[PDB]
Amino acid sequence: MLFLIYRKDRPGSLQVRIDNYAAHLAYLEPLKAKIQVGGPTLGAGTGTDDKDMTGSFLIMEAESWDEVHSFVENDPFTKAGLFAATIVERWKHG
Amino acid sequence: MLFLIYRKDRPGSLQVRIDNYAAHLAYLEPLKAKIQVGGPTLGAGTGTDDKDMTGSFLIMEAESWDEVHSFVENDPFTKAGLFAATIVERWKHG
Amino acid sequence: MLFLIYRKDRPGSLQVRIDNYAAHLAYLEPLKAKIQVGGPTLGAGTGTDDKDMTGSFLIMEAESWDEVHSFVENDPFTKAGLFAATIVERWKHG
Amino acid sequence: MLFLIYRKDRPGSLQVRIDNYAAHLAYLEPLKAKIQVGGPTLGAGTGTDDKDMTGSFLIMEAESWDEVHSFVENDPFTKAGLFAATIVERWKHG
């Protein structure tokens, strides 16, 4: 199955994002082929640098909701309390 | 610029989606170039057919927030009153 | 019926909120009797002043989804394009 | 601090809600005095009974984001894997 995974940072938790970004990126690495599209949501302005990140979006291939939840739970970002909003949706290409 | 566009149907409004899906697809058609990813969110169970659709997701290229809002507003789905939730985010590939 | 009405400002649009706050409050005034709970969402830190506003939340009584949706469309804040996210939910007290 | 806590059930998990509702409510009971508003989101139609529930909304007083997140995590509904979406927002009465 495919899932949308949409997560928005707590307001001014930017530092938590920057401090944990490398670990989060390393966490995604072994899952690459299962991750079809992924990248950070961005804030005010037109900047696309690290300081403009406000959250994470991914489309994830997984065999169950249990798998997705467990993937979310063990994200370094999740363990560090970075997120204020998390939305997960079963999904398909159109 | 890249934008996440997330919309969820009002609960109970599947038929509104069904009756208007063709018009919705026709509206998206000229924009194929600008749309990097597209598809519906899906509901309960494991089915991936039309009657499982519960919403719409796009990643789209646009020059402004104005352009994105205009695109959202002119969707046949919008005027049809289909959506109870709309989320737009500026976004980039990781 | 009762509805949750949840709206988040577009990042960087604080100025649009300031410019339209008066008209927005004017718009809510006649409908004061239908609004059970109302207030702005807040951003980073612990401040609770105008400059801390990041969005709008309401619990409102309406006779139908059409009434709620129209109430949302006619908001000065809507017509000014302040919001990046809007979520409406049918709801009841516990 | 006041927080909006918005949580939507995974599609088709109504029976998980029904089976655990009592344990969820007993969880909320000791914290009654910190909760200003609470009740479930409702789905399609106009029914307002148990089978209509689709999520949980709360406005709650807490001393920190970490307290809110710990509150949420220890909810019997959380541990049952009921929720697909969770949104938390710092907030104030207008």
* Cα three-residue angle C16-C19-C20, rounded to 5 degrees: 85
For testing contact with chain C, the best of D6, D89, D93 (most C CBs within 10 A): D89
Nearest-CA distance C66 → chain B (Å): 8
D12–B54: do the CB atoms touch at under 8 Å? no
Q: Which residues of C44-65 are buried (b: 16+ CB within 10 A; e: fewer)?
A: eeeebeeebbbbbbbbbebeeb
Residues in B touching D12 (Cβ below 8 Å): 43-45
Q: Which residue of A has its CA nearest to B24?
A: A94
Q: Number of folded domains in chain C?
A: 1
| Segments forming the whole domain that contains residue C67 | 2-94
Instruction: Measure CB to CB from residue C42 to each of D38, D39, D92 and give the nearest one.
Output: D92
Structure tokens at D77: 């509904």
Q: How many whole angstroms separate alpha carbon D38 and alpha carbon A71?
A: 30
B41–A94: do the CB atoms touch at under 8 Å? no
Which residues, other chains included, contact B61 with Cβ-Cβ below 8 Å and sequence gap of 6+?
B1, B2, B3, B33, B34, B35, B36
Q: How many whole angstroms separate alpha carbon D22 and alpha carbon D50?
A: 12
C88–B89: do the CB atoms touch at under 8 Å? no
Structure tokens at B26: 């026709």
- The H or E element containing residue C55 is strand C53-61
DSSP C2-45: EEEEEEEEPTT-HHHHHHHHHHHHHHHGGGGGGEEEEEEEE-SS
Instruction: Measure CB to CB from residue C6 to each of D6, D25, D40 and give the nearest one.
Output: D6
DSSP D33-70: GGEEEEEEEE-SSS--SGGGEEEEEEEEE-S-HHHHHH
Q: Which residue of D has its CA nearest to B14?
A: D44
Structure tokens at A45: 């302005």
DSSP conformational letter for C75: S
CB B36 within 8 A of CB B59: yes
Determination technique used: X-ray
Q: In terms of Cα–Cα distance, which of D24, D57, D34, D87 is closest to C36?
A: D57
* Resolution of the experimentally solved model in angstroms: 2.2
- Chains with at least 3 CB pairs less than 8 angstroms from chain D: A, B, C
Phi, psi of C92 (to 5 degrees): -150, 155
A84–D85: do the CB atoms touch at under 8 Å? no
DSSP conformational letter for C51: G
Cα dihedral across residues C40, B87, D64, D71: positive or negative: positive
Which residues, other chains included, contact D68 with Cβ-Cβ below 8 Å and sequence gap of 6+?
D3, D5, D60, D62, D88
Q: How many whole angstroms separate alpha carbon A14 and alpha carbon A54?
A: 7
Which residues, other chains included, contact D73 with Cβ-Cβ below 8 Å and sequence gap of 6+?
none
- For residue C64, give the CATH number of its domain: 3.30.70.1060
Instruction: Measure CB to CB from residue B65 to each of C10, C86, C88 and give the nearest one.
Output: C10
A37 interfaces chain B, CB cutoff of 8 Å: yes
C15 interfaces chain A, CB cutoff of 8 Å: no
Instruction: Measure CB to CB from residue C65 to each of B10, B65, B69 and give the nearest one.
Output: B10
Residue B29 burial (C-beta neighbours within 10 Å; 0-12, 13-18, 19+) = exposed
Q: Which residue of A has its CA nearest to B43?
A: A90
Residues in A touching C45 (Cβ below 8 Å): 11-12
D55 interfaces chain C, CB cutoff of 8 Å: yes
A65–D90: do the CB atoms touch at under 8 Å? no
- Identify the three-state secondary structure at position A1: coil
CB D31 within 8 A of CB D93: no
End-to-end CA distance of chain C: 14
